[PDB]
Amino acid sequence: VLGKPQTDPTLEWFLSHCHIHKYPSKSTLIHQGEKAETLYYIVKGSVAVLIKDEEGKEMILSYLNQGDFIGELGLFEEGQERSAWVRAKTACEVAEISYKKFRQLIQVNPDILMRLSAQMARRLQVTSEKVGNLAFLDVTGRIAQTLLNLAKQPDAMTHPDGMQIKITRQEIGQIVGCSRETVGRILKMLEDQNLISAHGKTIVVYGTR
Amino acid sequence: VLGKPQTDPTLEWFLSHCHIHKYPSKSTLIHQGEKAETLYYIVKGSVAVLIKDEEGKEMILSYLNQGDFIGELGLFEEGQERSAWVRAKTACEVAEISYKKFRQLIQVNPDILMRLSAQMARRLQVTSEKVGNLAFLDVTGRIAQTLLNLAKQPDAMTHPDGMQIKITRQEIGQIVGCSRETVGRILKMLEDQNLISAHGKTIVVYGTR
């Protein structure tokens, strides 16, 4: 896309081959058992990659950025039955098309599929160092821990009194390992400003906390 | 490799380009902070892929087969600093070479690196459904659970009285989530034949259990 420091001709060769334009979030696309025969290039917006366990827990394990890939876990993974990896996290705009036609532009350029591969591989790098993290039930300091982590990502939204990032305690179920319950204590104190200040579900770390 | 039903002329084009020949196991190659600039194609033998957490726990999270890849997590992941993924699990024979020259045979054929990619992606599929599994502290029935799982893999070794698979309870720390201690009860009962029969560290599910 233009207007931003990208400088990716090949992608503009890809985005002219797909369909950019998504929807506001909640729009999960494939993680219930649907053959992932369609790919979605999150070009703007960002989502919450989530997986299924051996006992059916489909929790969020990863998330993307404005310019990542979606459904690779079905076209590239070799899944062909959802395999799990997507649920909208923002109103995005994905360059979504079918990997029958795409696979053949990814085959016309030995850097296109290689560009996508590395994304997932980075997720391997994200899943290889945070598996037993939330599993540790470390909730003590592991909640606000991620909230300040949001202050370090493109999501910290400045506002005339603080810079927030709305995170339902549902993300926190996942990231911390405990439901919105133990973490419900904490996320409850947030609006109490006893730890933060959640302006609704938007959480504004004022400054001191 | 010849003698076995493989039928992979492209690999024989690749294995004639590398170095197959490993060692008995314990031979970890890259999982401590070594730039994974070298790749190892496990051609025979199989290893125990392990990862580092956010608190330094570097536990086995995956394992291979006789004909998988190693160090992909460094050459293809784009790691370039170990990133974690290997520790010998058997005396293997890896076709190990350096990804400078390899990358250029894998670049000579668009099915070679793609063949490897899918392997890792399959590991994505292995890590996307067993993250919170061992994290569940399900040890009740989650130990023998995997021991019988070994009876379903190429490892079940027939013997004139039972068919085993040696598994230190160390694997069980990982797979079940508890140190060989809770599982130490269990693995202790195994030699007692109160649950199994471990002929040393080799475990023989006789038949009834």
Curated annotation (Swiss-Prot), chains A, B:
Swiss-Prot/TrEMBL site (Activating region 2 (AR2)) positions: E96, K101
CC per GO annotation: cytosol
InterPro entries hit by this protein: cNMP-bd_CS, cNMP-bd_dom, cNMP-bd_dom_sf, Env_Response_Regulators, HTH_CRP, RmlC-like_jellyroll, Tscrpt_reg_HTH_Crp-type_CS, WH-like_DNA-bd_sf
Modification N6-acetyllysine, positions: K100
Domain of life, source organism: Bacteria
DNA-binding region residue numbers: 179-185
Chain spans, region Activating region 2 (AR2): 19-21
Listed PROSITE patterns: CNMP_BINDING_1, CNMP_BINDING_2, CNMP_BINDING_3, HTH_CRP_1, HTH_CRP_2
Pfam family, one: HTH_Crp_2
Sequence positions that bind 3',5'-cyclic AMP 2: A135, F136, Q170, E171, I172, G173, Q174, I175, V176, G177, C178, S179, R180
Domain HTH crp-type: residue ranges: 137-209
Gene Ontology terms, MF aspect: cAMP binding; DNA binding; DNA-binding transcription factor activity
Residues the entry annotates as binding 3',5'-cyclic AMP 1: G56, K57, E58, M59, I60, L61, S62, G71, E72, L73, R82, S83, T127, S128
Sequence segments annotated as region (Activating region 3 (AR3)): 52-58
Keyword Acetylation carried by entry: yes
Quaternary structure and partners: Homodimer, which upon binding cAMP is able to bind DNA. Binds the N- and C-terminus of RNA polymerase subunit RpoA and sigma-70 (RpoD).
Record's function text: A global transcription regulator. Complexes with cyclic AMP (cAMP) which allosterically activates DNA binding to regulate transcription. It can act as an activator, repressor, coactivator or corepressor. Induces a severe bend in DNA. Acts as a negative regulator of its own synthesis as well as for adenylate cyclase (cyaA), which generates cAMP. Plays a major role in carbon catabolite repression (CCR).
Domain commentary: The N-terminal domain binds cAMP and is responsible for homodimerization, while the C-terminal domain binds DNA when cAMP is bound.
Name used for this protein in its record: cAMP-activated global transcriptional regulator CRP
Gene name of the record: crp
